[PDB]
């Protein structure tokens, strides 16, 4: 690939620099490069991968929502055309991420944390595809997201404590999936509440730093619950 000639450590270093410069497209390219070196990623490296693509796709989703809103309120072909271009670009980014997961992140992920993180990611990028899909494709995409999230949940509940930030993050996102995507607000609320409640009871085992990581995500669960109830 385009980053194939750069040292693995240099790609990671440059991803960190790109993050500091808020150059998220660059950061994603560097992290794609790093994945494509063929070695398993560390916890820090998974964070960098996730931050990079989440920010790129975040920007695309924000742009798409703006354009769709203008398209809706406008009901020439320029708005629909431009919305479709952004849509295609977003689809391309999701396909790239799913590709990375397929080649070969998930298949080599043997530990709970790595496997859950990647399965969570699979769920997230199908969820983004679902936001812009229609018809039968949408139904299949939605079910694919649900399958990935559910497998992640199953592993997380068996192998990780309820304060694990990856477990918490997964539940947060899967809860949003239920509410916004699958139109299952009771499942969304139940998942968020139970996740919060189980984590609360395990907080006493955490160092100050881990306590901060876990309670941050718990706040986001509360924030969403506040919106939904």
């Amino acid at each position: 690939g385009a980053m194939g000639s750069m040292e693995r450590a240099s790609l990671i270093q440059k991803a960190k620099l790109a993050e500091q410069a808020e150059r998220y497209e660059d950061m994603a390219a560097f992290m794609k490069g790093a994945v494509e070196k063929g070695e398993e990623l560390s916890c820090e490296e998974r964070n960098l991968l996730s931050v990079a693509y989440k920010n790129v796709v975040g920007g695309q989703r924000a742009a798409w929502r703006v354009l769709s809103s203008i398209e809706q309120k406008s009901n020439g072909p320029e708005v629909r055309e431009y919305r479709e271009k952004v849509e295609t670009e977003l689809q391309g980014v999701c396909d790239t991420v799913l590709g990375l997961l397929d080649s070969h992140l998930i298949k080599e992920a043997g530990d709970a944390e790595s496997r859950v993180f990647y399965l969570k990611m699979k769920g997230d990028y199908y969820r983004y595809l679902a936001e812009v899909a229609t018809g039968d494709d949408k139904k299949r995409i939605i079910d694919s997201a649900r399958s990935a999230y559910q497998e992640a949940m199953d592993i997380s509940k068996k192998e990780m404590p309820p304060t694990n930030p990856i477990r918490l993050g997964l539940a947060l996102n899967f809860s949003v999936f239920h509410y916004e995507i699958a139109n299952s607000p009771e499942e969304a609320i139940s998942l968020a509440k139970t996740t919060f409640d189980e984590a609360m009871a395990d907080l006493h085992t955490l160092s100050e730093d881990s306590y901060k990581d876990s309670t941050l995500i718990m706040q986001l669960l509360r924030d969403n619950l506040t919106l939904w109830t």
Partner: peptide
């Protein structure tokens, strides 16, 4: 627009 991570 709800929180995700």
């Amino acid at each position: 627009f709800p929180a995700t991570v």
